[PDB]
């Protein structure tokens, strides 16, 4: 237990599976979706990861 | 991007098109018709096509 929770940080993963995947960090999501409006209003036939990857960064 | 990828072959193709482009426009001179239009058409169509392909390798 002692090595798994510090050298590979088993707890912080559960913490960041909660903040993001369970959407527990709500501060991130509102500015994310605020910046994400022009992308999502375009149909994703014309969306790619290169449009996505760093509006991620402005949000972060 | 020297490791053998599809990407690397595309980059080599761009370089060879650039070399053939340089050879024509260098010897051309100041603007003059020297039967240049056919070679020009092949060259500009090649640049447009391959640059369009390079927007498909951006993801």
């Amino acid at each position: 237990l002692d090595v798994l929770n510090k050298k590979y940080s088993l707890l912080d993963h559960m913490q960041a599976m909660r903040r993001y995947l369970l959407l527990g960090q709500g501060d991130f999501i509102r500015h994310l979706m605020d910046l994400l409006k022009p992308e999502l209003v375009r149909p994703a036939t014309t969306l790619y990861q290169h449009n996505l990857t760093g509006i991620l960064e402005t949000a972060v | 991007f020297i490791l053998l990828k599809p990407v690397f072959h595309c980059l080599n193709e761009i370089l060879d098109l650039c070399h053939s482009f340089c050879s024509l426009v260098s010897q051309n001179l100041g603007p003059l018709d020297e039967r240049g239009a056919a070679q020009l058409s092949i060259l500009v169509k090649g640049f447009s096509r391959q640059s369009s392909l390079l927007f498909k390798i951006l993801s």
Binding site: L1, L4, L10, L11, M14, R18, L22, G24 | -
Partner: protein, 61 residues
Amino acid sequence: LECSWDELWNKVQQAQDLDHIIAAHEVFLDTIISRCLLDSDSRALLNQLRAVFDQIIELQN
């Protein structure tokens, strides 16, 4: 995410075995499926809830 987070938070922070942590995370993740409408029984209820999200975006137009 608050009563649930409490249950998971106890069953890891005391747990003196890896296998107890594993099965603490397990039942927690499965329980959130039953609290929401993503269960096998509640698919119809989820359809009802989808039908009330249609009018919200409709009201925008």
